[PDB]
Amino acid sequence: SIPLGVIHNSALQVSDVDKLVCRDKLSSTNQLRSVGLNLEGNGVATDVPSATKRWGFRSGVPPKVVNYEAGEWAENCYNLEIKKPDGSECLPAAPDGIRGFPRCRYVHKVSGTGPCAGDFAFHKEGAFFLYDRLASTVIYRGTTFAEGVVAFLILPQAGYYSTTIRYQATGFGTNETEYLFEVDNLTYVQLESRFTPQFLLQLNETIYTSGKRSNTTGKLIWKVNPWAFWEXXXXX
Amino acid sequence: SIPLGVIHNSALQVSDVDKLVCRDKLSSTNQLRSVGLNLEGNGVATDVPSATKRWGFRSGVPPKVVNYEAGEWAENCYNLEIKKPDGSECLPAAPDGIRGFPRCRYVHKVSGTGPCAGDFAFHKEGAFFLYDRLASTVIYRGTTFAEGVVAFLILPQAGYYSTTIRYQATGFGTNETEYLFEVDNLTYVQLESRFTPQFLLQLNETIYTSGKRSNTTGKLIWKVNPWAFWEXXXXX
Amino acid sequence: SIPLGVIHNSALQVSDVDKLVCRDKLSSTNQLRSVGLNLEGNGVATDVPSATKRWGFRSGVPPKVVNYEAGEWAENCYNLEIKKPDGSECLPAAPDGIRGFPRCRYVHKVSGTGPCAGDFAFHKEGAFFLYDRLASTVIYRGTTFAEGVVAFLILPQAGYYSTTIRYQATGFGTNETEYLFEVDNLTYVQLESRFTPQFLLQLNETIYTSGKRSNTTGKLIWKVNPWAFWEXXXXX
Amino acid sequence: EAIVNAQPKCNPNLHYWTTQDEGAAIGLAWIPYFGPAAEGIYIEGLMHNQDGLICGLRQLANETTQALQLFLRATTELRTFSILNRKAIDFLLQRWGGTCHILGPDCCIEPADWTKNITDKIDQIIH
Amino acid sequence: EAIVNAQPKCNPNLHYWTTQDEGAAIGLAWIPYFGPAAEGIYIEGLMHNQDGLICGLRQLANETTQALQLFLRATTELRTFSILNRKAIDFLLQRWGGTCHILGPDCCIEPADWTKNITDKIDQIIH
Amino acid sequence: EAIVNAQPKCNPNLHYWTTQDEGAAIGLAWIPYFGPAAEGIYIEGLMHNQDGLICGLRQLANETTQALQLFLRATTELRTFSILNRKAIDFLLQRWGGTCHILGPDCCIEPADWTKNITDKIDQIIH
Numbered sequence A, B, C: 001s002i003p004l005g006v007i008h009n010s011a012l013q014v015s016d017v018d019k020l021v022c023r024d025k026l027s028s029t030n031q032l033r034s035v036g037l038n039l040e041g042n043g044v045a046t047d048v049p050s051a052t053k054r055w056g057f058r059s060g061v062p063p064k065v066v067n068y069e070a071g072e073w074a075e076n077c078y079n080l081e082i083k084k085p086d087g088s089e090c091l092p093a094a095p096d097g098i099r100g101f102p103r104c105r106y107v108h109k110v111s112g113t114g115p116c117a118g119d120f121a122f123h124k125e126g127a128f129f130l131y132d133r134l135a136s137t138v139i140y141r142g143t144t145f146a147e148g149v150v151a152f153l154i155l156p157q158a159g160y161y162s163t164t165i166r167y168q169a170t171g172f173g174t175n176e177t178e179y180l181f182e183v184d185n186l187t188y189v190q191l192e193s194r195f196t197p198q199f200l201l202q203l204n205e206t207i208y209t210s211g212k213r214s215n216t217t218g219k220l221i222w223k224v225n226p227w228a229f230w231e232x233x234x235x236x
Numbered sequence D, E, F: 001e002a003i004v005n006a007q008p009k010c011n012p013n014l015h016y017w018t019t020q021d022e023g024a025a026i027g028l029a030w031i032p033y034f035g036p037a038a039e040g041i042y043i044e045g046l047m048h049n050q051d052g053l054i055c056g057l058r059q060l061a062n063e064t065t066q067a068l069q070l071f072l073r074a075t076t077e078l079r080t081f082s083i084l085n086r087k088a089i090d091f092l093l094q095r096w097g098g099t100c101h102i103l104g105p106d107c108c109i110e111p112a113d114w115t116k117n118i119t120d121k122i123d124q125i126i127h
């Protein structure tokens, strides 16, 4: 049942479990590989508003982990600290030996609150949360993951920069979620789906250098009026 | 050493590890199966007094778990909440991923106290406690199990209702244990080995409908004066 | 990559992964064996001062455990209770199912303090800490281990006494560590590398029988002025 | 070795549960978020005592216990999932762990279909 | 079965990480005490879409998910590490799990080099 | 590759413990409730340095460490129990992972006993 990818006739194929190819040679378990591919590479929207609508809370389903040996450098990863309004944690601490996804250009660190109507947070399309060579069906607290899927291969016989982007959220995991991009602990920008990581980092740097940070003790919020990655108040 | 069951000559046999049958064909790991059979099906008494005398406490022996893939619908399962008289727990919480046995017509939920002279509760005849596709050598707190044993097979190539029955116990795990069947939090029936689940449920329903429940704040206890399943005061 | 030992021409050899010997017969997984050998048997110094300089603290490296099936009776094992000067534990509790090394003539139980500049204690020469049929890369609190290394073999087809020796230590895990051999809770002997287990046990027994124990409420410390195992104040 | 049920009773009918492997579910039921809870992943079946297999199986499980307990006593693994994979490996090593001597009792190589290939090739060469 | 990428986009280039197996490290870098931290154990590579393999792989991973999720739903094991070993076992059982009938389609035994041994031995015996 | 003990010393005698596999215990000692505690499950033996095997083994264990540590660094599994099963699988794949070419150096198929079957069948057909 679990498909196994094999190269035949200069093309990748799924191996026929009911047909035996004696020409296929498996001379060691080293020729077998489990690999993780990022949803990013299929063209899904990666902005935090769009991404978080792919995840949802559910009770009654025990979480499951499967390992994989090789992964894809990610443009977008996510790291979630979500509480209920009463302060209790919505996500479980990462189990022993589960570390963050190891290659992330941007880590979208989302902190905030939602009702969390379920014991674990699952991927609504059935994808996995890819961590460090472990793929889980659920999201762990404060642990960086990339969304992705796993494949199994039989092989033929013969620097790194990361930037954390911080967000506050209310009504997390619902239809009516609100996201603020965090400039400092008192300066925020209303988040829109169209904002790219690059735009958010420049927005931050121009707010710092034009003195648009809060200089009261109160919260300042800004609004803004005005292709895949590999290819209040107001302002303008 | 671990026997493997195989069908030869229209009969189940144990496979001879010292004899090679080239005619036996194992064409995938799917043909191998680990299965759990219930002690019930061999004719053991399943009443709570008789069943609990098969279990005992022992220190120095690390518990062990083995998985099995298919089980038998049980007529009788058990679920134990036993404390010492000083309030400390006698049984360990179920480890992560160990759930109750999934098919139980009657769950005998026994609450009470005993001396618990040992770190874990084992089966005195060497059988296992069958949980959800995990068989353990020991009993977990508050976790429904059936007593049973495990077999391993090589296959040939080619609704659900559950009722919980509650009991109180003193001197659990000793020669001199006392069991009360619980009608409500203040009405009990002295338990005898001969009482079947069906009899206990009718006893309960006729106590409710004849007003024999306690109507004080104190504990009322009743006494009663007057084949396998598939084939104080007084009353009469 | 992981070598496998095999007997050829009346001598043990490492099996050539790039050369196939059809004459080699592996007729069951029982012919394969993982085994643990003690550093002791290669001639390393086993006195506590020399042994503890082989271990060091390091952060950032997740600990790893591998099983082994057969081990060597040890002359020297160690059991460590090390705290920082502020009282916090330097070593993690033994994980579930990791027990002490099962055959130790002498258990050097070292209690005391050091700076513990790292999350786990590792073997600086890359050896393992051998416990009960589990080899770990790190030291567990209060858990008896022997230093050793693991081999893997393909086999050809065809009483017990233990003595605990107690020590106090300051500056554990540094260049300037101080060790006292403990006679009772108030009588100690300055520890030197040259002292054998046998000498320490006789030193203890002659201190007890000559009245050289402390008879104040204060700490008494003694100093002493004057080949492999298988082959203050002052005194003389 | 034949299996002799020596129990006080045998329930001759086996009402069982297990999990459906593989599944091939309907729609999105395979997605953990949308699929059954832990209680709803089971299938059921009923097997009768044809060929004595149910009573034989009850006795087989009974007699397996001693070897299985001795195996569990000697492992340091907390939960053992590898017994069937290891049996499958031992199955292969029993047959293929050494040189296969054709026509030898421990060599599961049937040369018959090819014997007729060579013999028909020789009758032709002789004629 | 051929693999039809049916995704809205395909990133044709695969910038990957994994771990170096085996290693054969320099000096004492293999010693846990002295070696890299968790962040420093990775190698990297870059693969382009020769033979369509990257876009094919993205679609293969997508289509594997249903069977892999159904397998995870039915296991009680918390973390599954044994899928590739079991596939390797099933590979061997598919070929060697029964008697190998030489010249039979399910028997991966090539007798050709030996056919020429017997035929050259027969031509000599006839001459 | 030959094994050259290069240690400062070798203890030539191996006083070992392990677990008895299988067991076949006396009476009810196999029952966990009644059997030995963790301290009492061990057997012992003593092996001397016949054929240099003990000193060879000490050096083999020493030299295994680098590859074994590099393997442990790259696994995410907390406790590894599968090394010997995987070696047994690799043993089988080395011999049977491809088509077996009879009389070929990588094919462990001995046709000799059957060569004499065909040759005695041919001498009879010629006579």
Ligand SMILES: *[C@@H]1O[C@H](CO)[C@@H](O[C@@H]2O[C@H](CO)[C@@H](O[C@@H]3O[C@H](CO[C@H]4O[C@H](CO)[C@@H](O)[C@H](O)[C@@H]4O[C@@H]4O[C@H](CO)[C@@H](O)[C@H](O)[C@H]4NC(C)=O)[C@@H](O)[C@H](O[C@H]4O[C@H](CO)[C@@H](O)[C@H](O)[C@@H]4O)[C@@H]3O)[C@H](O)[C@H]2NC(C)=O)[C@H](O)[C@H]1NC(C)=O
Residues within 6 Å of the ligand: A042, A124, A125, A126, A127, A149, D028, E006, E007, E008, E062, E063, E065
């Ligand atoms: C393997 O690859 C597949 C292909 O990429 C992945 O398929 C994806 O599967 C999910 C379901 O799990 C789908 O989600 C649904 O989307 C519906 C509408 O989305 C369409 O339009 C949006 C525009 O916002 C666009 O982004 C999508 O790409 C999608 O495309 C069109 O969809 C329509 C069907 O409506 C189809 O006729 C068109 O042909 C197609 N266009 C194409 C192919 O060019 C929503 O209405 C759905 O929401 C309902 O159902 C949900 C439960 O499933 C529920 O939560 C909601 O509340 C609501 O009731 C649903 O969200 C993706 O669209 C789909 N993507 C594609 C490209 O087909 C697959 O997930 C992947 N597997 C894994 C494991 O990753």
Ligand SMILES: *[C@@H]1O[C@H](CO)[C@@H](O[C@@H]2O[C@H](CO)[C@@H](O[C@@H]3O[C@H](CO[C@H]4O[C@H](CO)[C@@H](O)[C@H](O)[C@@H]4O[C@@H]4O[C@H](CO)[C@@H](O)[C@H](O)[C@H]4NC(C)=O)[C@@H](O)[C@H](O[C@H]4O[C@H](CO)[C@@H](O)[C@H](O)[C@@H]4O)[C@@H]3O)[C@H](O)[C@H]2NC(C)=O)[C@H](O)[C@H]1NC(C)=O
Residues within 6 Å of the ligand: B042, B124, B125, B126, B127, B149, D006, D007, D008, D062, D063, D065, F028
């Ligand atoms: C695999 O199947 C086997 C067969 O069903 C199971 O065997 C069972 O094994 C346990 C031991 O672990 C035995 O328990 C002992 O029972 C003795 C007396 O019981 C006899 O009488 C009672 C009546 O109350 C009856 O229920 C039993 O069925 C049993 O039958 C007779 O037993 C006698 C021997 O005494 C025999 O001569 C008869 O032939 C036999 N009748 C038959 C065969 O028709 C008790 O005295 C024992 O208690 C002592 O020993 C205990 C330690 O072992 C200790 O705790 C006690 O304090 C006391 O010192 C003991 O309880 C079962 O009788 C036996 N059942 C049968 C039918 O033989 C086996 O357990 C099973 N394996 C697994 C893993 O489940």
Ligand SMILES: *[C@@H]1O[C@H](CO)[C@@H](O[C@@H]2O[C@H](CO)[C@@H](O[C@@H]3O[C@H](CO[C@H]4O[C@H](CO)[C@@H](O)[C@H](O)[C@@H]4O[C@@H]4O[C@H](CO)[C@@H](O)[C@H](O)[C@H]4NC(C)=O)[C@@H](O)[C@H](O[C@H]4O[C@H](CO)[C@@H](O)[C@H](O)[C@@H]4O)[C@@H]3O)[C@H](O)[C@H]2NC(C)=O)[C@H](O)[C@H]1NC(C)=O
Residues within 6 Å of the ligand: C042, C124, C125, C126, C127, C149, E028, F006, F007, F008, F062, F063, F065
């Ligand atoms: C497999 O077997 C190998 C052989 O037994 C083991 O090799 C051991 O490896 C460690 C490194 O991990 C070495 O430790 C170093 O020792 C240096 C000096 O020790 C020499 O002298 C002492 C005297 O006190 C003696 O006990 C040793 O036996 C050793 O012998 C001589 O060493 C010199 C090299 O300096 C060599 O030229 C001689 O030929 C040799 N004599 C012989 C062969 O007869 C220290 O200077 C080192 O300390 C530095 O480096 C450390 C980091 O590595 C660092 O912590 C320090 O602060 C300092 O910077 C270092 O401690 C052992 O000497 C070596 N043993 C032998 C006999 O060679 C190997 O470990 C083992 N594998 C496993 C996994 O167990």
Ligand SMILES: CC1(C)CN(C(=O)[C@@]23C[C@@H]4C[C@@](c5ccccc5)(C[C@H](C2)/C4=C\Cc2ccccc2)C3)CC[C@H]1N
Residues within 6 Å of the ligand: A005, A007, A012, A033, A035, A036, A037, A069, A070, A071, A072, A153, A155, E014, E016, E017, E018, E019, E020, E021, E045, E047, E053, E054, E057
């Ligand atoms: C130690 C190693 C690095 C182990 N290796 C590998 O991990 C791989 C094996 C395979 C798939 C890789 C991959 C897939 C998805 C996600 C991340 C990585 C890329 C490349 C190297 C490759 C290429 C072949 C291929 C076949 C079929 C489809 C696509 C690619 C990982 C092989 C080489 C060896 N040096």
Ligand SMILES: CC1(C)CN(C(=O)[C@@]23C[C@@H]4C[C@@](c5ccccc5)(C[C@H](C2)/C4=C\Cc2ccccc2)C3)CC[C@H]1N
Residues within 6 Å of the ligand: B005, B007, B012, B033, B035, B036, B037, B069, B070, B071, B072, B153, B155, D014, D016, D017, D018, D019, D020, D021, D045, D047, D053, D054, D057
């Ligand atoms: C996905 C599946 C359901 C997997 N299967 C099974 O789990 C089994 C395989 C085997 C044993 C079963 C069993 C034994 C003991 C306790 C509980 C269940 C009953 C029956 C189906 C069967 C019958 C054959 C047999 C052989 C020898 C003795 C007794 C019975 C489980 C096979 C069919 C497939 N659809």
Ligand SMILES: CC1(C)CN(C(=O)[C@@]23C[C@@H]4C[C@@](c5ccccc5)(C[C@H](C2)/C4=C\Cc2ccccc2)C3)CC[C@H]1N
Residues within 6 Å of the ligand: C005, C007, C012, C033, C035, C036, C037, C069, C070, C071, C072, C153, C155, F014, F016, F017, F018, F019, F020, F021, F045, F047, F053, F054, F057
């Ligand atoms: C159930 C058993 C006890 C399992 N066995 C064993 O565990 C062994 C297998 C092998 C290695 C032993 C060992 C090595 C290192 C550390 C501790 C022990 C000693 C001896 C028995 C042996 C001897 C052969 C050898 C080959 C190559 C080098 C050195 C020795 C363990 C085999 C016999 C069986 N009764």
Ligand SMILES: *[C@@H]1O[C@H](CO)[C@@H](O)[C@H](O)[C@H]1NC(C)=O
Residues within 6 Å of the ligand: A175, A176
């Ligand atoms: C969620 O989103 C919109 C309104 O914002 C609507 O379609 C849907 O009914 C809402 N559901 C709830 C429960 O508010």
Ligand SMILES: *[C@@H]1O[C@H](CO)[C@@H](O)[C@H](O)[C@H]1NC(C)=O
Residues within 6 Å of the ligand: A185
């Ligand atoms: C911002 O807030 C976080 C938590 O609320 C705190 O840890 C951090 O130190 C703060 N930074 C400054 C500059 O106050």
Ligand SMILES: *[C@@H]1O[C@H](CO)[C@@H](O)[C@H](O)[C@H]1NC(C)=O
Residues within 6 Å of the ligand: A163, A164, A165, A166, A201, A204, A205, A208
């Ligand atoms: C925002 O800009 C300031 C000033 O350059 C910088 O210190 C800070 O790290 C920036 N934040 C992000 C997320 O890059």
Ligand SMILES: *[C@@H]1O[C@H](CO)[C@@H](O)[C@H](O)[C@H]1NC(C)=O
Residues within 6 Å of the ligand: A210, A211, A212, A213, A214, A215, A220
């Ligand atoms: C203080 O804050 C106000 C409003 O955010 C802004 O107009 C002003 O530039 C800030 N001060 C400085 C010195 O920039």
Ligand SMILES: *[C@@H]1O[C@H](CO)[C@@H](O)[C@H](O)[C@H]1NC(C)=O
Residues within 6 Å of the ligand: B175, B176
């Ligand atoms: C347990 O049961 C009976 C008395 O009730 C007797 O045979 C046995 O000695 C008792 N043992 C103890 C310790 O009370």
Ligand SMILES: *[C@@H]1O[C@H](CO)[C@@H](O)[C@H](O)[C@H]1NC(C)=O
Residues within 6 Å of the ligand: B185
């Ligand atoms: C009966 O007692 C239990 C625990 O003692 C309690 O949880 C339950 O609510 C009680 N039921 C009633 C009707 O009082």
Ligand SMILES: *[C@@H]1O[C@H](CO)[C@@H](O)[C@H](O)[C@H]1NC(C)=O
Residues within 6 Å of the ligand: B163, B164, B165, B166, B201, B204, B205, B208
């Ligand atoms: C006992 O009878 C009452 C009244 O019918 C019912 O509510 C209760 O659940 C019964 N108890 C059991 C264990 O069936």
Ligand SMILES: *[C@@H]1O[C@H](CO)[C@@H](O)[C@H](O)[C@H]1NC(C)=O
Residues within 6 Å of the ligand: B210, B211, B212, B213, B214, B215, B220
């Ligand atoms: C009150 O309790 C008594 C004794 O249990 C019983 O005789 C009587 O029937 C009860 N009351 C009613 C109304 O049934």
Ligand SMILES: *[C@@H]1O[C@H](CO)[C@@H](O)[C@H](O)[C@H]1NC(C)=O
Residues within 6 Å of the ligand: C175, C176
């Ligand atoms: C440790 O040991 C000696 C002095 O006792 C010296 O060689 C070395 O520098 C010392 N290092 C430190 C940090 O004290």
Ligand SMILES: *[C@@H]1O[C@H](CO)[C@@H](O)[C@H](O)[C@H]1NC(C)=O
Residues within 6 Å of the ligand: C185
């Ligand atoms: C010695 O001290 C230890 C701990 O400090 C304590 O447990 C032990 O009882 C003491 N022994 C005596 C004889 O006081």
